[PDB]
Amino acid sequence: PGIVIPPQEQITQHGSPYGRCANKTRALTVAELRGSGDLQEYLRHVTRGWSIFALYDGTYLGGEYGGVIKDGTPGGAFDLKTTFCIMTTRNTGQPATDHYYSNVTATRLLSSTNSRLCAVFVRSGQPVIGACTSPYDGKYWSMYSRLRKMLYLIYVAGISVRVHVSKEEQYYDYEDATFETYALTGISICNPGSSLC
Amino acid sequence: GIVIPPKALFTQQGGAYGRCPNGTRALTVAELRGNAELQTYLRQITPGWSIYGLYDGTYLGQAYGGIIKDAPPGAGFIYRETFCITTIYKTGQPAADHYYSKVTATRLLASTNSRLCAVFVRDGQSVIGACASPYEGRYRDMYDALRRLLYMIYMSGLAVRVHVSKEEQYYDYEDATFQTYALTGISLCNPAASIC
Amino acid sequence: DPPATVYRYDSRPPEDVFQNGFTAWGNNDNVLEHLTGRSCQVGSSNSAFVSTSSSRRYTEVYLEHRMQEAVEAERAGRGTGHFIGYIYEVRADNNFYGAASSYFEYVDTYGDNAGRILAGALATYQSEYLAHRRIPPENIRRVTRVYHNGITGETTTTEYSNARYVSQQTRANPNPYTSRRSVASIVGTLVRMAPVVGACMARQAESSEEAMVLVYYESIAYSF
Amino acid sequence: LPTHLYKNFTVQELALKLKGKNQEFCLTAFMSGRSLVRACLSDAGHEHDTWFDTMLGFAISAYALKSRIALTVEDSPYPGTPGDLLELQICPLNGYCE
Amino acid sequence: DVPYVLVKTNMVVTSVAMKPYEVTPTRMLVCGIAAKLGAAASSPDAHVPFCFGKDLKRPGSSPMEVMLRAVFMQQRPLRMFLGPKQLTFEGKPALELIRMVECSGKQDCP
Amino acid sequence: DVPYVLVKTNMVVTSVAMKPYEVTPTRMLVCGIAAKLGAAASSPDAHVPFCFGKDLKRPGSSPMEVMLRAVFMQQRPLRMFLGPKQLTFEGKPALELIRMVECSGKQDCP
Numbered sequence: 056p057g058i059v060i061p062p063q064e065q066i067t068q069h070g071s072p073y074g075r076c077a078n079k080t081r082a083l084t085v086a087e088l089r090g091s092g093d094l095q096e097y098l099r100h101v102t103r104g105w106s107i108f109a110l111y112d113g114t115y116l117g118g119e120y121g122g123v124i125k126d127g128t129p130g131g132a133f134d135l136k137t138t139f140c141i142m143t144t145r146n147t148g149q150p151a152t153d154h155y156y157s158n159v160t161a162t163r164l165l166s167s168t169n170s171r172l173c174a175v176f177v178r179s180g181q182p183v184i185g186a187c188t189s190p191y192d193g194k195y196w197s198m199y200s201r202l203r204k205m206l207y208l209i210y211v212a213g214i215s216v217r218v219h220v221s222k223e224e225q226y227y228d229y230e231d232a233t234f235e236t237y238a239l240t241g242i243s244i245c246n247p248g249s250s251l252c
Numbered sequence: 253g254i255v256i257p258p259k260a261l262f263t264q265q266g267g268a269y270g271r272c273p274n275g276t277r278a279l280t281v282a283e284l285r286g287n288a289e290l291q292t293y294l295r296q297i298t299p300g301w302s303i304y305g306l307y308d309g310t311y312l313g314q315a316y317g318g319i320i321k322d323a324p325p326g327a328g329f330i331y332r333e334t335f336c337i338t339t340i341y342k343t344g345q346p347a348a349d350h351y352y353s354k355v356t357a358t359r360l361l362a363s364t365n366s367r368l369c370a371v372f373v374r375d376g377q378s379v380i381g382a383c384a385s386p387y388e389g390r391y392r393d394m395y396d397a398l399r400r401l402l403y404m405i406y407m408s409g410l411a412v413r414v415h416v417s418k419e420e421q422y423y424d425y426e427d428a429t430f431q432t433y434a435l436t437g438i439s440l441c442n443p444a445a446s447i448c
Numbered sequence: 449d450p451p452a453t454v455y456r457y458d459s460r461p462p463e464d465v466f467q468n469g470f471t472a473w474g475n476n477d478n479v480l481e482h483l484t485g486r487s488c489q490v491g492s493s494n495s496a497f498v499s500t501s502s503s504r505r506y507t508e509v510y511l512e513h514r515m516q517e518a519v520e521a522e523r524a525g526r527g528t529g530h531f532i533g534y535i536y537e538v539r540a541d542n543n544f545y546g547a548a549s550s551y552f553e554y555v556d557t558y559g560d561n562a563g564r565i566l567a568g569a570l571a572t573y574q575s576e577y578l579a580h581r582r583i584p585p586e587n588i589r590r591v592t593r594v595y596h597n598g599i600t601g602e603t604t605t606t607e608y609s610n611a612r613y614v615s616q617q618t619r620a621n622p623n624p625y626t627s628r629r630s631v632a633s634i635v636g637t638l639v640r641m642a643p644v645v646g647a648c649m650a651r652q653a654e655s656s657e658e659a660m661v662l663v664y665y666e667s668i669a670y671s672f
Numbered sequence: 673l674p675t676h677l678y679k680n681f682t683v684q685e686l687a688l689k690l691k692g693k694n695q696e697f698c699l700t701a702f703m704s705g706r707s708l709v710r711a712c713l714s715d716a717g718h719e720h721d722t723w724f725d726t727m728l729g730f731a732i733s734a735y736a737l738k739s740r741i742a743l744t745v746e747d748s749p750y751p752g753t754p755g756d757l758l759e760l761q762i763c764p765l766n767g768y769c770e
Numbered sequence: 771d772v773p774y775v776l777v778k779t780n781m782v783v784t785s786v787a788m789k790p791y792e793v794t795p796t797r798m799l800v801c802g803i804a805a806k807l808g809a810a811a812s813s814p815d816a817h818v819p820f821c822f823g824k825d826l827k828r829p830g831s832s833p834m835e836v837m838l839r840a841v842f843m844q845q846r847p848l849r850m851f852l853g854p855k856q857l858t859f860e861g862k863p864a865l866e867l868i869r870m871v872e873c874s875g876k877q878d879c880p
Numbered sequence: 881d882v883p884y885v886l887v888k889t890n891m892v893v894t895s896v897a898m899k900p901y902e903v904t905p906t907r908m909l910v911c912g913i914a915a916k917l918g919a920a921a922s923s924p925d926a927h928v929p930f931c932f933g934k935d936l937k938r939p940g941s942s943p944m945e946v947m948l949r950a951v952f953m954q955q956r957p958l959r960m961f962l963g964p965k966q967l968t969f970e971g972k973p974a975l976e977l978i979r980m981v982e983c984s985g986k987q988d989c990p
């Protein structure tokens with residue numbers, strides 16, 4: 056409950072074999088399909104036969120089966136011939152204004168082939184925002200070489216920073232995310248109120 | 253028994269006043285003493301009353317007869333002609349992989365536009381030497397990655413299995429009792445994984 | 449074979465050490481917080497362990513650098529280049545236990561995620577042995593005293609021997625020290641820079657004769 | 673060009689942010705007696721120069737090592753505007769810059 | 771290779787390494803050995819060797835490198851999507867790593 | 881500029897500094913303060929300023945650079961080959977460091 060749900064268009068035109076969702080895309084969860092009406096529909100009107108598909112942590116008995124969402128196990132049904140992959144990048148279309156979150160602490164690192172490096176910035180248990188960096192694609196690729204250095208520093212040190220994100224792009228890399236996740240664009244080991252934050 | 257750089261390595265144009273051009277290294281006396289033909293060659297090429305400087309000693313031209321005279325480090329540098337060896341030698345051996353387990357990295361060594369080396373050590377013994385340069389060599393391109401792990405294992409205990417390509421031999425360290433080759437791989441020791 | 453003789457660098461003199469020896473900072477005997485530096489930090493020093501090392505050369509190079517420091521302090525008009533350091537020699541009993549082993553064993557009781565890669569690389573580095581509780585006079589044998597005058601450039605070695613020293617026929621414990629998993633929060637391994645020294649070592653030495661800069665090995669062991 | 677040099681200050685704040693089409697990192701240098709010295713370095717919106725990177729990584733070590741540093745700003749043409757880090761120096765670890 | 775991608779949870783990277791790409795002068799691998807918390811020394815999941823390519827023509831560290839460095843250092847449990855392809859690390863086949871995510875809890879790491 | 885290469889033994893790197901290379905802007909200077917381990921406060925070799933050029937065109941740390949970083953954090957005794965040329969560091973000149981090897985012991989470092 057309270058999971059960011061991928062917008063219908065994040066789905067890809069064809070599912071992937073051997074469980075190998077393609078690069079820059081990732082398997083859909085049981086919990087995400089469920090929460091997404093638009094998706095369920097899509098699958099229903101596009102799935103023929105007595106077909107069963109692999110979702111990250113479960114199975115989708117489509118076609119003649121009705122459109123059933125069976126709870127599974129992480130990757131445990133990757134033997135099926137097709138897994139449902141979602142794309143991870145979304146051009147939000149919002150304006151590139153600055154958004155910052157103070158007192159945050161980079162945690163839960165995520166990476167993937169030819170994609171982006173992300174972290175979940177928490178604040179007293181509770182997550183707050185997710186942010187990512189990637190030299191590969193992205194409005195802000197330039198800042199990768201510079202960001203990865205501060206990110207790694209604060210990560211292994213536990214340095215309570217103040218993170219800045221540009222909502223111009225949205226990423227769905229994490230699974231069942233209680234938090235949103237945008238493009239990282241700055242970090243600051245900061246003094247309260249500092250003109251430098 | 254010090255590794256004796258081969259005569260072939262000898263720089264026809266030695267460095268002036270102890271400044272052997274990047275890529276080369278001043279030849280020591282111990283090396284010159286043990287290098288038969290390099291010496292013979294020397295007689296055949298030093299016009300009398302000419303003194304050439306080595307790392308330690310000096311070479312009294314064949315007028316004095318050709319004498320390897322000891323001397324402090326950098327001392328012989330006072331003269332205009334210094335003896336140097338280029339530090340890379342193409343072994344011409346096959347490009348196969350050889351490794352040394354349970355070693356530790358020590359004794360870093362850097363030149364200007366040449367390599368970064370380290371002497372790998374097992375229980376006191378200097379097992380092997382390995383180098384990596386972003387300037388010349390086969391694994392020329394693997395430098396930027398290797399340096400990062402060389403730097404880590406150096407900076408912490410961390411034993412290791414080092415992978416070396418006897419393909420090319422390096423003579424960067426002076427008077428060595430271990431051989432040095434091109435570094436191609438590092439693998440932190442892991443018993444369980446049957447690595448070290 | 450467990451070492452018989454260990455060493456301890458210190459800013460304390462023989463007239464003190466030879467009578468009272470060293471007696472642990474506190475009861476916290478958790479092997480991880482120690483090697484990790486937690487139980488030897490400001491407002492947190494409680495290690496029931498006296499840090500010593502089985503390698504004299506180690507203590508040697510540390511003192512040799514603490515001295516070069518004095519020389520550089522004076523150069524900045526911050527001192528008089530003078531330094532006096534000691535290197536006590538100790539007879540180890542079963543009350544002495546290896547730092548590394550202690551580390552490894554902990555990790556194989558609570559699993560990989562409970563330890564720290566560098567905390568274990570460090571124990572093996574400083575060749576540390578943990579004196580449980582205290583290391584008393586009878587175990588303290590000799591003592592090299594190093595004096596250096598940074599201004600003359602002259603070094604002056606000097607030895608002394610403890611009368612109270614007692615000759616037993618011991619060696620360190622052949623068995624790993626053991627403690628309940630740390631419920632403490634540990635960020636990394638606290639270490640003093642140049643040369644890299646564990647916090648419980650570098651820290652324990654300094655006494656009554658400006659805070660020590662303890663850093664996270666993890667933040668510096670790898671480039672940026 | 674009213675340059676200046678500060679010795680024996682510690683890096684207290686470090687921040688990489690975006691500034692228009694240029695990135696820009698800044699540090700705050702602090703000495704118990706004085707006010708904060710503050711400087712920034714920004715990619716000239718120009719390529720090649722490993723410069724920005726090189727200095728950022730250096731300033732990150734100064735921050736990480738908790739060492740006293742000796743910096744050289746170049747005074748901003750406007751007040752309340754930090755200057756430029758012209759060069760940075762890491763004093764002897766555990767000690768002071770002479 | 772393996773038939774399908776394996777997802778493994780509670781893996782702790784315990785060794786790391788680099789080697790050349792056994793077939794490409796333009797790539798190289800960054801390998802490791804991961805272990806699943808609680809397994810038996812006997813258990814296969816006690817030391818899963820992996821590797822991922824690195825492009826020797828694009829200067830820097832990849833997003834996956836930065837992370838391995840970090841989680842190896844702090845000994846952080848991972849969910850790794852190893853497979854389905856295989857590469858050789860230390861004269862033995864090792865599963866390619868295509869994605870890894872730090873475990874935040876038993877929920878995401880069963 | 882000095883007239884001939886000087887080999888200094890038993891020195892430790894005491895302070896590092898980054899600076900723009902006065903001349904070409906494709907280069908910068910990596911300068912330092914080397915000081916013979918143990919020497920006298922006033923001893924000549926108690927404060928030997930050196931520099932070496934960095935190519936801002938090439939990415940990454942040069943071999944010299946990776947060493948200067950390692951020996952300066954660990955304070956390792958070296959053998960530096962200084963001069964003959966001289967760069968500027970702090971108004972006063974500075975010898976160009978051109979090679980450095982660590983010391984195995986007295987045999988190589990007296």
Ligand SMILES: Nc1ncnc2c1ncn2[C@@H]1O[C@H](COP(=O)(O)OP(=O)(O)OP(=O)(O)O)[C@@H](O)[C@H]1O
Nearest residue numbers: 671672725726728729730733896940941945948949
């Ligand atoms: N403490 C230090 N002492 C000396 N040189 C340092 C120190 N910290 C960093 N350097 C150098 O400053 C420069 C930048 O270092 P940094 O770690 O930021 O990037 P890098 O090492 O070049 O690697 P990358 O390619 O990942 O940026 C190089 O000269 C790096 O070796």
